[PDB]
Design a protein around this ligand. Sequence first.
Ligand SMILES: Nc1ncnc2c1ncn2[C@@H]1O[C@H](COP(=O)(O)OP(=O)(O)O)[C@@H](O)[C@H]1O
Ligand SMILES: Nc1ncnc2c1ncn2[C@@H]1O[C@H](COP(=O)(O)OP(=O)(O)O)[C@@H](O)[C@H]1O
Ligand SMILES: Nc1ncnc2c1ncn2[C@@H]1O[C@H](COP(=O)(O)OP(=O)(O)O)[C@@H](O)[C@H]1O
Ligand SMILES: Nc1ncnc2c1ncn2[C@@H]1O[C@H](COP(=O)(O)OP(=O)(O)O)[C@@H](O)[C@H]1O
Lengths: 428, 440, 424, 427, 122, 18
Amino acid sequence: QRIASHSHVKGLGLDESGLAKQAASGLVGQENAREACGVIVELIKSKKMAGRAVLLAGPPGTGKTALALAIAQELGSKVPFCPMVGSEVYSTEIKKTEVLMENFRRAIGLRIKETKEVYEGEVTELTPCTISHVIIGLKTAKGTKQLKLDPSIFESLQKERVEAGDVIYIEANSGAVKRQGRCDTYATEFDLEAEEYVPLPKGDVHKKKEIIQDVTLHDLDVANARPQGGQDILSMMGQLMKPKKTEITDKLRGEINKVVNKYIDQGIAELVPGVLFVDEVHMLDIECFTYLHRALESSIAPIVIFASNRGNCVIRGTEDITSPHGIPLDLLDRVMIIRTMLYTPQEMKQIIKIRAQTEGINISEEALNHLGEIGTKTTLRYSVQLLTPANLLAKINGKDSIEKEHVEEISELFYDAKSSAKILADQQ
Amino acid sequence: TQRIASHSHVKGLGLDESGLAKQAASGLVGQENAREACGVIVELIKSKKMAGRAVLLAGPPGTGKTALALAIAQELGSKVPFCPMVGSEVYSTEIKKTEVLMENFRRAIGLRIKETKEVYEGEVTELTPCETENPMGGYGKTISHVIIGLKTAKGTKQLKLDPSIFESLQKERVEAGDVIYIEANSGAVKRQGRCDTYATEFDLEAEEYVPLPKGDVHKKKEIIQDVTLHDLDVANARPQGGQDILSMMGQLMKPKKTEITDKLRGEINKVVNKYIDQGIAELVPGVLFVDEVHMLDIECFTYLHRALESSIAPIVIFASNRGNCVIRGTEDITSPHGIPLDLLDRVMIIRTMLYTPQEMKQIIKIRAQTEGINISEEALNHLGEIGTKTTLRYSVQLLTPANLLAKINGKDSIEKEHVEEISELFYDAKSSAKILADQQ
Amino acid sequence: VTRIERIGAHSHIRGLGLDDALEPRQASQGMVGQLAARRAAGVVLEMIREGKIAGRAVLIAGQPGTGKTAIAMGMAQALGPDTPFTAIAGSEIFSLEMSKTEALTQAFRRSIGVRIKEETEIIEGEVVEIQIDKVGKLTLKTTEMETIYDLGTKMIESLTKDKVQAGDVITIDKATGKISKLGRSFTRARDYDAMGSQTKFVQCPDGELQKRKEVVHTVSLHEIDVINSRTQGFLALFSGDTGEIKSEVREQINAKVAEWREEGKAEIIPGVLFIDEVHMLDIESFSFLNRALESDMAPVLIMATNRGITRIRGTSYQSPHGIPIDLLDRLLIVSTTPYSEKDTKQILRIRCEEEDVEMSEDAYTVLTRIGLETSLRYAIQLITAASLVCRKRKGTEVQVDDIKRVYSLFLDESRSTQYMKEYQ
Amino acid sequence: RIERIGAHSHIRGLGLDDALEPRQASQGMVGQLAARRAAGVVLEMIREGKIAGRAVLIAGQPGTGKTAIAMGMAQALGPDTPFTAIAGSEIFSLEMSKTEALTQAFRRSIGVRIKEETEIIEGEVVEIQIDRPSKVGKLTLKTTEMETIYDLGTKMIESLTKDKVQAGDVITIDKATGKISKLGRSFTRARDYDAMGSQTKFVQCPDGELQKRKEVVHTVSLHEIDVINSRTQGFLALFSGDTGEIKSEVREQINAKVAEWREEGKAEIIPGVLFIDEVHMLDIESFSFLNRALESDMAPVLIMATNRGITRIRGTSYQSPHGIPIDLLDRLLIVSTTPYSEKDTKQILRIRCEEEDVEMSEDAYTVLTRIGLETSLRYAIQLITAASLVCRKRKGTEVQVDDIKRVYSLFLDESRSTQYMKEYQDA
Amino acid sequence: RHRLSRRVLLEVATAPDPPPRPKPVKMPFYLDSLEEKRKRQRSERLERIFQLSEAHGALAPVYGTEVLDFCTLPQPVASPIGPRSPGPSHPTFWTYTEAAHRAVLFPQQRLDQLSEIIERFI
Amino acid sequence: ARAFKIIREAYKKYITAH
Ligand SMILES: Nc1ncnc2c1ncn2[C@@H]1O[C@H](COP(=O)(O)OP(=O)(O)O)[C@@H](O)[C@H]1O
Ligand SMILES: Nc1ncnc2c1ncn2[C@@H]1O[C@H](COP(=O)(O)OP(=O)(O)O)[C@@H](O)[C@H]1O
Ligand SMILES: Nc1ncnc2c1ncn2[C@@H]1O[C@H](COP(=O)(O)OP(=O)(O)O)[C@@H](O)[C@H]1O
Ligand SMILES: Nc1ncnc2c1ncn2[C@@H]1O[C@H](COP(=O)(O)OP(=O)(O)O)[C@@H](O)[C@H]1O
């Protein structure tokens, strides 16, 4: 199923006591970093601390993004997780500040149990009783039922042109009448006619079932950003786009928070804090940092994970101010920094074996040994790449497994970064 | 409500009848050489003769540029328009830089226009036709006039109108016993519903029954409009209404200025002349106060002494605060006052002197009088002393918090200890700079 | 139970610890130390709540982690929710639809409140019958009385375009600003199974049909957006206004608000505009403020910058606090002295009291020492970190050993930089 | 009427003879014989309009009459010939590119006058009958020489009712379209004479034949054509801000159709002048485009005033004379302006003060020339009105030397303010 | 004030009342299971309508309607021509001159002005 | 308001008699 780069990482792999193993979950080594990750993962499940940040600092290829993906996986699906690249903040349509604001409102999830109900079946008759009400008979395989249908939605009933014979939905909450098409038994009434002829529903016309699906807070904000309807010319909202347009703090998000708190107090909604993740934070502008190190101090900001893929370098936007990890010292504080260190030959070999047994390739011992040794000369992220074409050539040669004659011969077709730099020193 | 500001004390230049500045008058003190220099340009403005003149208020920070700059709007009075703007308002996201300059240039040129129109009001009692003895062949009588009786709180009078007015009335679908509105100069007849005084019961319909109009049936009162050239420009630029679908684009923001000069040499700029020479409008050339002019871009500075050479342009009162500084938008240029030499060659510079302890003391006294603080003579002296060290701004800003500390400490007048306590809670720029230099 | 707002950074700051005489308490209302700074904060809060003068800017400066933003949030909390308090970061004005100046004008006008009050005669009652022949009559009903009303063309058009029906509890006023407020209840189950989204059953109104309703609401002076376009006010729910037409804004909104202040239908209540990290503003915005603070109606400013002698954005010059001197002239700077061994432990104990992280005395001492060595804010994170580490340890009180266990997991900025000897 | 005088309102045209020989101080132009003769040559080249795509640059010391010569040429050119004055900084727009702004500026100085021979009627309305029920009516028009009766049709009746003209009104009836343009009222009044009404005004009735063939003319610029032809937004060429013309679909078609019209004789040509003041502001790309924009038959001549010397070209780091690259500078020939001498500055000040209607004594002229020779000429000209106000304030008659000397101490020109700038205000 | 509490709805389920007639002039087949099912579904129906009615009126507007109508000045905010003048009784009529109104041309008036060049240049 | 109830009580009697 489209094996990805981090598909083998399924969790941090801590014990019941919180110590890091060489767990089969997909992570080996990085004992202290994995322990810190597991310690902070409990903060998310506690659902009491907001406005935090964790900086995963270390050389490239050491698996900080792997640690972030493991944190995301261990939580599960109930709590949202929003991975974002630092470069994505630079949007040419809307200011970066509001982009980051909306990004902060996307991690926070919201579970709500709606016990809605809809009515489905072949509409058998409409009898509009200045309309007092309209009775509609819906037929299904399990019987027929007559419903007094709130004449206010007779407008929509006519808008759908529905009449005796059609199969339609209707939502009890709002009147969302939806024409599925004509009934199956009415097909062939005209040997040629452009119709759908949807099958007759088999279940109970009265379809009452609970929906415990969750939505994001930014989704709510967007749904409350622009109006709806074509009163006179407002139809223009189904046309020219709405790219992440800026909301306003003073009158929209405040009211959203108020109404959400009201609903939560009534016991209907259910809040679930998420986890935001910013990749290559060094790419953000100095003003992005100046806004972030004060917005994350609020009482609603979710826990964030910062990942810097470089050491002491000049911060973008100043060109003359150096700071460790490309993050200013003013913002580098308030952030629990977790170091990520290099691996050992044994750990590299274990990672390569995990990637192999995950991708589905069986490899001999003498082959895996040199494939991992290459991980010492080259970076860990090169043997993983070489592994696949070796199996490809082997299968081309009939051999289902990877012998040492393939991994050592495919390393010649492709060159690594250091070799290319050595050859490319000529500027061409 | 007053809502005391930072410059709500300057009432005028304080010049005598001979044009000499008084030592202290109209809230301003000192700066006689400057208050007399910027007083001649007041008469220049009141002449409505020159166009594109410029005066540059160049001095150190806090000397009073804005003090005696907006005071000219007081001497000139509110009748002539006064358009103030800071140099940072030119940078915009929907209108080019050099265009905001022009837009502000035409907003300063006012144009007051007067019109006289008769008016009719009152309940129409009866509308009977006046007979014309068979003007055409023997078909039937003809309406030569229409006798209409209008009732008002003053009295009821019968009036004659033209037959075209009769046709307009018939197609208007009005009835008797209601209030109408006639304007003989144009001929259009408007309706104000029925007469709320006797015509309507407790019914619910909000037909907007107007009470029996009070006053003479016939009334005339000249309407005096005060429109600027920028207002009429934007009006001809962003039309209004509910027709002509092009105008129906009320959903879009439509901030789209940059009025093309075609619409300038053509419309309003021309009908302005056709109304002035006709005796309907009187041009009221105003002032264009542009402070912090050093913020303008090189393009803006270049366009400035091209728009200042146009016959249609108001005076300009610049306020440059920087000394010999690099022009914004260029490199390795050290033009004085942060203004290009070419533009400085076109402006008359008024140099404001530095305030002495006694003048700053008078200024503090006047600002305390304005804010309503009952500062004592010892507190005033100490404020002057501690203001001779720092700038005048910090010195005169220690009146509101000191007064609060006084009121909190059971007092009705700022004492010597109150400003001392406030002087330690808050400090000026130099003190904070030293504290920062001592730290990392 | 879990609300939208759990404990954040500045959550223990529930006010400003000053006596009636503005005398700062050593520890009160969550704040600690900063005696002179908190007294200055209270002095400026006094003029804020007073609202006579306009153009007061108070700058709070100091080392990173001395309580500038803390004092700002304390003032925000000490100040009642009635007066506006617009807190924005120095980078919020760098908009693409708005210039660096118009967004600042909107932020300024957002901190000026306007308590509007309106009175309108409302005719409300359950519709019993509606006849139409054009002319007709209306039979409105209440639980107390009933009456007939004769309609006309203007009313019939409004009763037809708005599909009122027998039972709809209508609400009418002078000028016929009709509202389909709610529906009768006696027409039980008008909707057996499916009901409209906007429909809802409500009990019959009480009292007489004619009732005087009084509505009071606090709208900000930024309401110009309500008339900046032909939209129905909903431009204030998104970007919307970008131009801030000076003529319209000033010469209509200010004049009409002054007129309302005389009629008594409104009253201005100036607020505060707190620009956090203001050193990110360019010389353009500073030179703009220089004049904006000189206007008739302008909120007070509060700034929190830690910059020493640093460069001013958009220029090669350097000035104190990284902003031009001409602006410092129009400010009122306040100090925020660094904390001592005692104040650090005190604020750490207060922060532990927030999340009920019961700590030991030795753990408190060790954490205070660590925070004095590396940083104040860092010690605030170790509280929750060690709490979570001890929770899995099946404990009930963070110990010194649990603090040291966390001290190795989450390294600080200093030690993190010290560990960058590999240089990848 | 009321359009206050400006800094360049005194020049009413180049003071040249029939042989392009500049006079000393005729028609407001003082001195500057060489540059004035050059401008006269280029203007004689303009009123001929048989070659398009040339350019001429006027360079010299600041305040020597470059923009003055430009305004003089503009005035001597008169109407019926598009003249566009633009500063180099005006093309830096946000709604269109620089090349687009330059194309618009060029095409704004190319006029197309379509001669239309439309026959109409012009006479005083004597009587009108209209039978409303379709509706039918009649009309009677009178001129000083003859009268006639017209049997109006349905659409003519509709038009006259929309205009709602009445007896005595003098109107013009377009036989083609039927548009009724009323010039005023003849010697007739009193619709009822008992109803209210405004004051009455009358004008003589038209003369000659009732129906006569006159000549209307519609003169528009090529820019206005491309504009109203750009898109279907109704009533363009004003539209307050917006031009997004397409190169091929519109521009080339406009050019081709104008050439076709010139071929048959509908509207041949009337080239104009594009005075680009302070052209040093233009970017390197602007000059790159101007290089090939002048290579077109529809490229009108442009005049540029330069004040810079050997200075880097904006948008790059290439030093070049006049701040203009030698690529564009290869076409345009340059004209040099000599700094005004003592007698030249004195006479310039004299004319500029006689333009403002202010009388200055003989010694006032001498002292002001002294100031304007030690200082810039613009400051000496600005000191003409400033000194003319203190005199009036003291109920004086003509400006004396004391008033000028006082207003000189009241203000600072360029050097008395920088020399006093020794306080380290801000930098 | 009138939220129509639950029990009120249950009580309203009683038989209806008869309408008035104002003209005064002066100063064995039965199925218990079917009845039970109908009663249960009717109770569910009433609970459903009560839930939906309570869920549609729980949100309060951010401004409402009187707030905007109060802040909403006449359509022309600062335009040089006045809004719809219902009569002379309100100041707004004696503030805008018709001459100033002729200074601003509406788009259809621009059409009337440009008709000639619109015809002969487009 | 209270007059409405008395007026309805008065109406009842007339209709009851006729
Ligand atoms: N502890 C680990 N266990 C398994 N695989 C790892 C581990 N650390 C790193 N890797 C592998 O090395 C690669 C590093 O990629 P990435 O996380 O993007 O680098 P970095 O995060 O250092 O910028 C990942 O694709 C991952 O599969
Ligand atoms: N002539 C004066 N009389 C009274 N007060 C003055 C005078 N000049 C300056 N001030 C005071 O000094 C303060 C700052 O001066 P300002 O004009 O803003 O400085 P600048 O114009 O140089 O930027 C003002 O608030 C004003 O009260
Ligand atoms: N007097 C105080 N009382 C309680 N907490 C404080 C105090 N001063 C500082 N803090 C804490 O220290 C942190 C400092 O953060 P911040 O205000 O952003 O630093 P600065 O304003 O110095 O840049 C705050 O999160 C706050 O909780
Ligand atoms: N030939 C001339 N005749 C009369 N006045 C002149 C002449 N040339 C320049 N001037 C005067 O010089 C002033 C400014 O000249 P300007 O056009 O700015 O010269 P430049 O274009 O070289 O800067 C004008 O006010 C004008 O009165």
